[PDB]
Each structure stands twice: as structure tokens, then as C-alpha cells.
């Protein structure tokens, strides 16, 4: 198990534009296209992301390509963010995958409300951090995925995911 297989389990793969859990147009492996309601605005951003006229449909390779770019940028934003960096640096390899997972799903911006949980992870207080992480809209909205990520932070193993 690695970051790629972990996110491919949490996000799935869809080759046709679909709506995510919050109702936004997405395609591939969790690739958010737009927060607008317009299917047209979505098709447009998609064509722009792929470099071809797609008509809302892409190939597996194209999806994987978008996925490689998005993990890379998730990582790189963590590294550039001053509150994130130090958390990330302090963690072991499994827990780092859990943090990237959070960032990919919710952006540096969503992850901003985790000030308290981030401090707890940094201090390595696993059980407390797991309790604090659960008190969030995130956990209430996508409980099964949250529980898997949460368990990865609590345990430091990939158990939630075999
Ligand atoms: Cl893009
Ligand atoms: Cl879920």
C-alpha cells in the first residue's frame, strides 16, 4: 500500500463527468473540475485540463495522468504551507500518506480548521488526535472514508485499507 493505491480506494475511478459527494463536477480519480453548477463550465475545464475536445469523457490513461499531477501538487502544497510543513515533517511514512489524503480531499484551506488536531498529531498523541479529528463536518459528511484515514493516524498501519 502506498498513497496512490490508498487514494484510488477512497475516490474510485470514473471516466465520465460525475458529481462528487458535495455535488461538484468531478472526473477520474477525484479530480475536482469546478464548483459551478454548469455542466458546460465543467466540460470546458475538462477540455482545458486534457488538452483535447473531450465531450465529457476521458481514457484511463488520461485519468491517471490527472491523478499523478494532483498527488504531486497535494504534496508540494503541503511542503509550501508553513502550518503544514512541520506536521508533515514530524510524521512517519504511513501517517504522511494519511495527511496527503486529507489535503487531496479537502485542500490546504479545508485542512485549516484542523489546527488543534494538527498540533496533537505533531505531539504524537494518537488517540487524542483521533477523537479531535472526528468532531468535524468532514467526519460527519464522509464517515467511512474519515474513519479509515483516522485509523491510519491512530495506528500508523494500513490496516483500515487490507
Ligand atoms: Cl489541471
Ligand atoms: Cl465515506
From Swiss-Prot:
EC number: 3.2.1.17
Gene Ontology MF, one: lysozyme activity
Record field: catalytic activity: Hydrolysis of (1->4)-beta-linkages between N-acetylmuramic acid and N-acetyl-D-glucosamine residues in a peptidoglycan and between N-acetyl-D-glucosamine residues in chitodextrins
Effect of residue 20 to C: Nearly no effet on specific enzymatic activity
Keywords: Antimicrobial, Bacteriolytic enzyme, Cytolysis, Glycosidase, Host cell lysis by virus, Host cytoplasm, Hydrolase, Viral release from host cell
Active site residues per record: 11 (proton donor/acceptor), 20 (proton donor/acceptor)
Record's subcellular location: Host cytoplasm
Gene3D superfamilies hit by this protein: 1.10.530.40
Pfam families: Phage_lysozyme
Domain of life where this protein originates: Viruses
Effect seen on changing residue 20 to A/N/S/T: Complete loss of enzymatic activity
Residues engaged in binding substrate: 32, 104, 117, 132
A GO biological process held by the record: peptidoglycan catabolic process
Database matches in HAMAP family: ENDOLYSIN_T4
Protein name stated in the entry: Endolysin
Gene, per the UniProt record: E
